[PDB]
């Protein structure tokens, strides 16, 4: 076995390995660090890539970012995505 920092994951409702550090500075980054598992975070990144490819999204387009931000919030909220 190994040693891992773990958190009660808001998405999966179970104790899982957490991130080693917040993904970025700020309140949102802190929320993710404290309440989102590494698995949930990784699964979100995979889903985000899928959405960007399937919808032809551009991170520099405000609407495309808004869409992704709305899906991320839903994805990591605790609800069934």
Q: Both tokens of residue 10?
A: 């808001």
Q: How was this structure determined?
A: X-ray
Residue 47 sits in a domain of what CATH number?
Answer: 1.10.3880.10
The DSSP-derived string for 19-44 is: -SS-SSSSHHHHHHHHH-BHHHHHHH
> Is 15:6 a contact under the CB 8 Å cutoff?
yes
> Is 64:71 a contact under the CB 8 Å cutoff?
no
> Is 19:33 a contact under the CB 8 Å cutoff?
yes
Burial environment of residue 38 by CB neighbours within 10 A (0 to 12, 13 to 18, 19 or more): middle
* Resolution to one decimal, Å: 1.8
Domain that holds residue 45: 1-81
* Rounded distance between C-alpha atoms, residue 19 and residue 9, angstroms: 11
Q: Both tokens of residue 15?
A: 């104790």
Number of domains the chain is built from: 1
């Amino acid at each position: 076995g190994h040693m891992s920092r773990t958190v009660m994951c808001r998405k999966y409702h179970e104790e899982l390995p957490g991130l080693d550090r917040p993904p970025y500075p700020g309140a949102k980054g802190e929320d993710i660090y404290n309440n989102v598992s590494r698995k949930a975070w990784d699964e979100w990144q995979k889903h985000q890539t899928m959405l960007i490819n399937e919808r032809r999204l551009n991170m520099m387009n405000a609407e495309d970012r808004k869409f992704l931000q709305q899906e991320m919030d839903k994805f990591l909220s605790g609800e069934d995505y």
